[PDB]
From a paper:
We have successfully solved the structure of the 70S ribosome in two post-incorporation states. Another messenger RNA (mRNA) construct and tRNATyr let us model the second G·U mismatch with the cysteine codon UGC and the anticodon QUA bound in the P-site. The structures of both states revealed the remarkable finding that a G·U mismatch mimics a canonical Watson–Crick pair at either of the first two positions of the codon–anticodon duplex. Further analysis showed that the codon–anticodon duplexes containing G·U mismatches have an overall geometry that is identical to that of the corresponding cognate duplexes consisting of standard Watson–Crick pairs. Although the 3 Å resolution of our models is not sufficient to distinguish between the two tautomeric forms, the observed Watson–Crick-like geometries for the G·U pairs can be rationalized by the presence of enol tautomers in the P-site. For the second codon–anticodon position, a bend caused by a wobble G·U pair would be also forbidden because the tight shape of the codon–anticodon mini-helix is defined by the tRNA anticodon rigid structure and a tertiary structure of tRNA stabilized by the ribosome. Our present structure with the P-site G·U mismatches trapped in a Watson–Crick geometry, as well as the previous report on the A-site with G·U in Watson–Crick-like geometries, fully support these observations.
Residue numbers in the entry:
A (entry chain P8): 1 to 47
B (entry chain 11): 2 to 273
The structure:
RNA sequence: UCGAUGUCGGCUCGUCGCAUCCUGGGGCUGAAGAAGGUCCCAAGGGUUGGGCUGUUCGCCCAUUAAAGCGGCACGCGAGCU
RNA sequence: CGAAUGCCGGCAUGAGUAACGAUAAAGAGGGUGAGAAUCCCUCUCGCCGUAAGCCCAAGGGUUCCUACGCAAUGGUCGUCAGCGUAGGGUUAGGCGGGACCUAAGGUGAAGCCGAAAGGCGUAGCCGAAGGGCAGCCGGUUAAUAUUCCGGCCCUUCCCGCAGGUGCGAUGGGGGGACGCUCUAGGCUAGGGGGACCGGAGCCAUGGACGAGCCCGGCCAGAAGCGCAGGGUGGGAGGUAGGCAAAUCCGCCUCCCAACAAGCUCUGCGUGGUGGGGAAGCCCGUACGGGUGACAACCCCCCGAAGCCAGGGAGCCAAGAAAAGCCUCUAAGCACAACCUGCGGGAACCCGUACCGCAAACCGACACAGGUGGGCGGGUGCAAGAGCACUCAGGCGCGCGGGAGAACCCUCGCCAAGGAACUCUGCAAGUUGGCCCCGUAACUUCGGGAGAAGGGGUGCUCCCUGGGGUGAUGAGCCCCGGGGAGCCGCAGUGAACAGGCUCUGGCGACUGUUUACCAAAAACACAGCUCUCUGCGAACUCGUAAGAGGAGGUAUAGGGAGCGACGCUUGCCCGGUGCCGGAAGGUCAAGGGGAGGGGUGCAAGCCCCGAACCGAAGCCCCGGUGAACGGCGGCCGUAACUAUAACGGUCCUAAGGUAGCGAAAUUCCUUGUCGGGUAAGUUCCGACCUGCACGAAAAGCGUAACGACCGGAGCGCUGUCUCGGCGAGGGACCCGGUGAAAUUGAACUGGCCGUGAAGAUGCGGCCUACCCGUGGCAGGACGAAAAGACCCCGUGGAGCUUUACUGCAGC
RNA sequence: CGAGCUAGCCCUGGCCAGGGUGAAGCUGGGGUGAGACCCAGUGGAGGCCCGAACCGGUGGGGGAUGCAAACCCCUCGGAUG
RNA sequence: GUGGUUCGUGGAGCCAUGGGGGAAUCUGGGCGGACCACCGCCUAAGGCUAAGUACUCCGGGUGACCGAUAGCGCACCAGUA
RNA sequence: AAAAUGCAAAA
RNA sequence: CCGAGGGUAGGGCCCGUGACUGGGGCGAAGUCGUAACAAGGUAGCUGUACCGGAAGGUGCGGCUGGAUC
RNA sequence: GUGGGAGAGGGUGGUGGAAUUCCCGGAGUAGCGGUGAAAUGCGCAGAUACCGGGAGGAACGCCGAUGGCGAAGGCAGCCA
């Protein structure tokens, strides 16, 4: 069965990456929230 | 004109293809071409604003000359008559004696090797462009500007023309391809003759796929929708329109007249 | 019984009732004989194969000693369809 | 706290129960070790082989190599491991990416728009699996190699000399540069063969010292050269176009080769040289190494979908950009600079282990599922990437041992019968490839067709045709033809491998669909009709700017229905809808103010306020049917009945034409009649009483098509009469590991009663030692899911409209 | 916050063994006043035929605390659009 | 035409303003709840201004606050696995 | 240039 | 080897027969109308097309086998 | 053969004027149409009758005949 998670790395940073969150006031607040909660990662992994 | 086929498959039996003998050489294209951005029906938001579009063969845009007056008085030889995938007509390559090369939409009867020219001078002959005021009343004519120096906007489609029905002051009266009687300004360039490739209306696509190549995706009747979707959606089996027939947006699609009323160009129209 | 008692028909497996279809035993006869009619006793066993239809039922073909009628959640879906 | 299908946690029950994840498959010897079916090595056996082998890309992130380890992970075991600890291991001017280019799209000085957040946007910039760009063969490590080493071969940048030239760009021009189908000539890869060359060694078990058998017989390589191809005209004159300028490019006229002739660029070959190099035998291992050798290193044949490559031809749906590169000139500068040759120096960053059709990626798992490109050998079958077996290489699917019950699953066979089975031939079977003979209605002349239905098929010998390569030959390949004969039940001897025919319904056809219960007669479709839209089009998206439409222009575009094709599509415009109408009626704000009012001494301030003029809309008047839609009733009447061509009359906007009709529509209904069958609620043909067909929500047909639905026949069958036997995987037994829903507590029997109306649990009676195992499903109103049906709730939500009330839009 | 599933479109690439049928055109011969046209060869079209890969998911059986929260077997549809 | 206020169009003034019209400078102008008169109040169409007030990331003090299923989600390398 | 239908069977 | 014939399959022609259906002939006095023969009361006929209970009507073209005071 | 002739014989392209219709304008009223007589219809929203402008299609008056041409069907403004 083809499942729902088909990891590609560029997509991931292209989509949820740091620079992508900071473009959009929606996302800049995401970062704000995430930071205030004290997340160890404000943005998914990397690479 | 209009090549037909023996039914060696179904849908080849009804299929009918244009006649390309009228095409001089040049299968390929003068680098007066330019890439076409295909929309898919979608506008600058990511949105379908015209339904059922896309797929269909790649196309290269032939840039064509809809102002003939920038070149007044410079004649040109008609070098090629070729296929323009972007319009119903065929285009003419013409080599100006200027040395400049340009595309013209190809009038009916204009032949390769012809002398072509545009300006108030001009012979009245196929291919020549003049202002309207200098064209003899009752000559058919095509590629017509609606306003002076804004480019040819009327009678461009295969086999269309317009005819000069008379003059009044600064303006001249045309019968347009629609049958509408319109005042066009005297100063507007037109180019004498009629567009030609007129067997065009007689082609027959013949299979579904052929409609696809032309970039036209399947068209589905509101009748077959549900009511979320269309005014004609619903009702157990089949069912009639059940209301005066409508568009998806709900406005009336049989007879209901949509031209703006208070439009300014009303003063320059006389007809249907 | 709705914090669930799966519904017709079929197939499978039966079991029981008798208001008995057959076979056994009888009385009356408008019973000569053979063959019937009708009532009485009798639940031991038996009670066919097909065409049509989802059908139950029913009609029909070919037979039969007979081709019985009911109950068992209109028996039986933690047995099947 | 005792209950909330409460919440968290712990431990029970089912239970030593199901299962332990593909039925490709195992056996033994030896080794190690506390311990061995499970680790190592050997022999035997089995399984993949267009893979279950090998190489790239994603993705994963140390899983890699090695030493030490076995608590947990591993469905058992474990001495093993993708596991624990530690140590190693990834080497590039040339491979990929970046100090290159542009695609969609993104972003975006300029500019436009938006209450704010923000939305657009030309240039530009970013963006690649596309364009551009210079490395091939070996060897080496336990673990990297186009990366190190070895040989041969290139690239750019910088400095320098020599020679050449108006040098010079982000600007002009050329080029880059393009489809699909079919392809020619020559090569290469790859493969088969060789009586030739090289080679350890073998003669078994009856035979063979043999032109025996077994093994191998190449790889890379600049200049030069050869063969095959790609690209390309040369000179002058004029010049007003290519947004400045060009000597370039375009255009016109001359003249000369039309030919690769040349010039040029690729491919292949050959090349100085470098390097590889089998079986077998012996060691030497978790596998690698030595000899074989001074290895040989050649001829023939088949041959790409790959190369020459911008090759050719046909066709219509008409097939990226930009840079690199060449060229032209501009400022500038011509001590510059650029081109060519040579020489020295300079050349950065990131990736590089390993898995990669999977036990390392996506699927909670060492999951029978999903995952893009390349290579993918041999023989035989017509071909083939099919199928069977098989090299190379890789595997035996991380529980085993037995036993030989019911039952289940997957398989094999069957006397006679042959669809009786059953909603239905569901399922299985039959058929099956190739070559030849043959082949109907009907048809749109293509089809229908593989219609149907037949015959052939192996092997041996003889004679003989033509082709390819060679040479006009031999050998090697390739198609064939003819005669004679041998064997079996059988020659597509195994494997891959249509059952056929008749006949209705629906849909013209190929397509499309409810991912995961519907693939259809639904949707699409070519095509027909209506309608809107003159172009800043209509229409859609957006508050807007903007965009799509469309770089289109009525032969176009948008909306609606109908749905190839054939023959056709009748009557009603009263109502609704749209369309047309300068009058008239009505009508809002506004205009206008007769005339009235509050209040002030008053000048006045301030209020009402009738006429009248006043838009759309509505009203009114027409039109309109491929616009919404609609297309009658009662009574009489013909030689006997019978029926009613005919008449009467009421109503209507007008009363259903053609054609179909018990129908995907017919209630009564299994209508009646015919056909088929021994028998036919279905089926086919009829009739017409059409409950309740009927003409673009089209009517009636139509060849061809269909995993659609109906009916009939032939063929053939374990579907059946009606079962039997056999096979394997389970079920059972032993050793290892060991779940699950469920569960008020249980010391949990039958009948007849009773009871909230269906009792193991109450009464009466009967029957009944205690405890399990394998089996069957009648009951515990068995499990599961707080019934989906039904109602209730002034509970939700999707949908509709001439429900109300708004809003956008117009 | 989501189109790394799925739906459509846009840009750029890749894939489709083998076999079958044999349209137009062209060429030649017949035919004619010239034509239509007929035959033969060539030719190689097609939402054409059979069938792998690939894409499906027709019918049945199995599975049903599964190998699997859609799977396995046999069968079947398309396979140059 | 709207908003604000207790004011939901009401007799609806005040305060703010999107549209239209559009003055005056102390004998000017705004207000006292439609309007008028009279008596009063106030000076629009520029700007600034501590303090008293709100809060608790942080530090301290204190509790008829909790005591590891409580108390913060976290007493423990938790916004972690 | 015209209102207007019909006429039992046999002889 | 050929071979009467038998068997399996697929065509062709002909004859009979079939629910029902199409018209045709004929049949002493049936029903409806008046189309034609006298400008037959619309001159008729006619090929074709449409329509209509029926004869027929109407369109287009044609013929005189019709028509002048 | 050569020289002459008549003709609506055919094919193609153009072109003229009369009239009908519709639309625009102008003036202009109470009716027009139509028949056997009428009605339906058209007209105060300005019809008919009148003038001017324009569009478009078809057919070609007088010549013209009982004539011509063609094999028949058939062929008639004018020009090449
Ligand atoms: Mg998941
Ligand atoms: Mg990526
Ligand atoms: Mg966007
Ligand atoms: Mg379309
Ligand atoms: Mg459609
Ligand atoms: Mg629907
Ligand atoms: Mg929607
Ligand atoms: Mg709606
Ligand atoms: Mg509807
Ligand atoms: Mg529905
Ligand atoms: Mg319906
Ligand atoms: Mg419907
Ligand atoms: Mg229009
Ligand atoms: Mg209950
Ligand atoms: Mg209930
Ligand atoms: Mg319960
Ligand atoms: Mg239950
Ligand atoms: Mg009795
Ligand atoms: Mg008896
Ligand atoms: Mg007796
Ligand atoms: Mg007596
Ligand atoms: Mg007796
Ligand atoms: Mg007697
Ligand atoms: Mg008995
Ligand atoms: Mg009994
Ligand atoms: Mg039968
Ligand atoms: Mg049946
Ligand atoms: Mg019945
Ligand atoms: Mg019976
Ligand atoms: Mg019974
Ligand atoms: Mg029951
Ligand atoms: Mg069941
Ligand atoms: Mg049942
Ligand atoms: Mg409790
Ligand atoms: Mg309690
Ligand atoms: Mg529960
Ligand atoms: Mg419970
Ligand atoms: Mg055990
Ligand atoms: Mg048990
Ligand atoms: Mg058990
Ligand atoms: Mg077990
Ligand atoms: Mg296993
Ligand atoms: Mg196993
Ligand atoms: Mg041992
Ligand atoms: Mg062993
Ligand atoms: Mg094992
Ligand atoms: Mg192989
Ligand atoms: Mg490997
Ligand atoms: Mg990676
Ligand atoms: Mg992982
Ligand atoms: Mg490695
Ligand atoms: Mg390892
Ligand atoms: Mg070890
Ligand atoms: Mg362990
Ligand atoms: Mg273990
Ligand atoms: Mg496991
Ligand atoms: Mg390790
Ligand atoms: Mg180097
Ligand atoms: Mg640099
Ligand atoms: Mg870049
Ligand atoms: Mg760039
Ligand atoms: Mg932007
Ligand atoms: Mg800006
Ligand atoms: Mg842009
Ligand atoms: Mg790239
Ligand atoms: Mg590249
Ligand atoms: Mg590179
Ligand atoms: Mg390695
Ligand atoms: Mg190497
Ligand atoms: Mg090196
Ligand atoms: Mg100079
Ligand atoms: Mg230069
Ligand atoms: Mg340059
Ligand atoms: Mg340069
Ligand atoms: Mg350029
Ligand atoms: Mg260019
Ligand atoms: Mg080409
Ligand atoms: Mg080679
Ligand atoms: Mg070779
Ligand atoms: Mg060899
Ligand atoms: Mg050899
Ligand atoms: Mg030798
Ligand atoms: Mg030797
Ligand atoms: Mg021997
Ligand atoms: Mg070489
Ligand atoms: Mg030249
Ligand atoms: Mg010059
Ligand atoms: Mg020149
Ligand atoms: Mg210039
Ligand atoms: Mg060379
Ligand atoms: Mg050597
Ligand atoms: Mg080319
Ligand atoms: Mg080419
Ligand atoms: Mg650039
Ligand atoms: Mg200068
Ligand atoms: Mg130079
Ligand atoms: Mg150098
Ligand atoms: Mg590496
Ligand atoms: Mg590697
Ligand atoms: Mg690997
Ligand atoms: Mg796989
Ligand atoms: Mg692969
Ligand atoms: Mg692996
Ligand atoms: Mg592997
Ligand atoms: Mg692995
Ligand atoms: Mg993992
Ligand atoms: Mg495993
Ligand atoms: Mg797996
Ligand atoms: Mg996994
Ligand atoms: Mg795959
Ligand atoms: Mg191969
Ligand atoms: Mg092979
Ligand atoms: Mg072979
Ligand atoms: Mg053989
Ligand atoms: Mg084969
Ligand atoms: Mg291959
Ligand atoms: Mg295979
Ligand atoms: Mg091996
Ligand atoms: Mg046997
Ligand atoms: Mg049998
Ligand atoms: Mg038998
Ligand atoms: Mg039989
Ligand atoms: Mg039966
Ligand atoms: Mg039966
Ligand atoms: Mg059937
Ligand atoms: Mg079957
Ligand atoms: Mg089969
Ligand atoms: Mg037949
Ligand atoms: Mg055929
Ligand atoms: Mg057929
Ligand atoms: Mg056959
Ligand atoms: Mg057939
Ligand atoms: Mg033989
Ligand atoms: Mg043999
Ligand atoms: Mg034989
Ligand atoms: Mg076989
Ligand atoms: Mg087959
Ligand atoms: Mg029919
Ligand atoms: Mg279909
Ligand atoms: Mg049809
Ligand atoms: Mg559908
Ligand atoms: Mg489905
Ligand atoms: Mg689902
Ligand atoms: Mg669903
Ligand atoms: Mg299907
Ligand atoms: Mg809007
Ligand atoms: Mg706009
Ligand atoms: Mg636009
Ligand atoms: Mg555009
Ligand atoms: Mg349209
Ligand atoms: Mg339809
Ligand atoms: Mg109506
Ligand atoms: Mg009306
Ligand atoms: Mg109406
Ligand atoms: Mg109106
Ligand atoms: Mg009015
Ligand atoms: Mg007023
Ligand atoms: Mg007023
Ligand atoms: Mg007063
Ligand atoms: Mg009005
Ligand atoms: Mg009306
Ligand atoms: Mg109709
Ligand atoms: Mg109605
Ligand atoms: Mg009536
Ligand atoms: Mg009555
Ligand atoms: Mg009828
Ligand atoms: Mg009929
Ligand atoms: Mg009927
Ligand atoms: Mg009906
Ligand atoms: Mg019968
Ligand atoms: Mg019958
Ligand atoms: Mg029937
Ligand atoms: Mg219907
Ligand atoms: Mg209907
Ligand atoms: Mg209807
Ligand atoms: Mg209709
Ligand atoms: Mg239909
Ligand atoms: Mg039909
Ligand atoms: Mg299909
Ligand atoms: Mg189907
Ligand atoms: Mg059986
Ligand atoms: Mg058995
Ligand atoms: Mg067994
Ligand atoms: Mg007990
Ligand atoms: Mg009881
Ligand atoms: Mg008790
Ligand atoms: Mg008791
Ligand atoms: Mg038990
Ligand atoms: Mg039970
Ligand atoms: Mg039960
Ligand atoms: Mg409930
Ligand atoms: Mg209520
Ligand atoms: Mg409610
Ligand atoms: Mg996607
Ligand atoms: Mg592509
Ligand atoms: Mg092929
Ligand atoms: Mg041919
Ligand atoms: Mg096909
Ligand atoms: Mg097919
Ligand atoms: Mg097939
Ligand atoms: Mg296969
Ligand atoms: Mg492949
Ligand atoms: Mg896929
Ligand atoms: Mg699908
Ligand atoms: Mg399936
Ligand atoms: Mg399905
Ligand atoms: Mg099943
Ligand atoms: Mg199933
Ligand atoms: Mg198949
Ligand atoms: Mg298939
Ligand atoms: Mg196929
Ligand atoms: Mg395509
Ligand atoms: Mg106000
Ligand atoms: Mg308020
Ligand atoms: Mg207020
Ligand atoms: Mg109120
Ligand atoms: Mg107020
Ligand atoms: Mg204001
Ligand atoms: Mg102030
Ligand atoms: Mg303060
Ligand atoms: Mg507080
Ligand atoms: Mg504090
Ligand atoms: Mg304490
Ligand atoms: Mg605790
Ligand atoms: Mg806690
Ligand atoms: Mg404690
Ligand atoms: Mg806290
Ligand atoms: Mg907590
Ligand atoms: Mg912590
Ligand atoms: Mg009469
Ligand atoms: Mg014979
Ligand atoms: Mg015979
Ligand atoms: Mg008859
Ligand atoms: Mg008459
Ligand atoms: Mg008469
Ligand atoms: Mg008459
Ligand atoms: Mg009539
Ligand atoms: Mg006439
Ligand atoms: Mg005549
Ligand atoms: Mg008036
Ligand atoms: Mg007038």
């Amino acid at each position: 069965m083809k499942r729902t998670w088909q990891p590609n790395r560029r997509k991931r940073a292209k989509t949820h990456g740091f620079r992508a969150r900071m473009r959009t006031p929606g996302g800049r607040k995401v970062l704000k929230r995430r930071r205030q909660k004290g997340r160890w990662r404000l943005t998914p992994a990397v690479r | 004109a209009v090549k037909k086929f023996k039914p060696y498959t179904p849908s080849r039996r009804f299929m009918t293809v244009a006649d390309f003998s009228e095409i001089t050489k040049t299968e390929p294209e003068k680098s007066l071409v330019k890439p076409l951005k295909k929309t898919g029906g979608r506008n600058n938001q990511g949105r379908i604003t015209v339904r059922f579009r896309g797929g269909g063969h790649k196309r290269l845009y032939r840039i064509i000359d809809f102002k003939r007056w920038d070149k007044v008085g410079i004649p040109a030889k008609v070098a090629a008559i070729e296929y323009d995938p972007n319009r119903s007509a065929r285009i003419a390559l013409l080599h100006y004696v200027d040395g400049e090369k340009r595309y013209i939409i190809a009038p009916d009867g204009l032949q390769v090797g012809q002398q072509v020219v545009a300006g108030p001078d001009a012979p009245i002959q196929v291919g020549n462009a003049l202002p309207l005021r200098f064209i003899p009343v009752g000559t058919v004519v095509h590629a017509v500007e609606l306003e002076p120096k804004k480019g040819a906007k009327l009678a461009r489609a295969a086999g269309t023309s317009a005819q000069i029905q008379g003059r009044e002051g600064d303006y001249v009266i045309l019968r347009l391809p629609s049958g509408e009687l319109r005042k066009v300004h005297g100063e507007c360039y037109a180019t004498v003759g009629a567009v030609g490739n007129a067997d065009h209306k007689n082609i027959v696509l013949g299979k579904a796929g052929r409609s696809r190549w032309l970039g036209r995706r399947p068209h589905v009747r509101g009748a077959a929708m549900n009511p979320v979707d269309h005014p004609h959606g619903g009702g157990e089996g089949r069912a009639p329109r059940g209301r005066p027939p409508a568009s998806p947006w709900g406005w009336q699609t049989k007879g209901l007249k949509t031209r703006k009323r208070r439009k300014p160009s009303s003063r320059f129209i006389i007809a249907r």
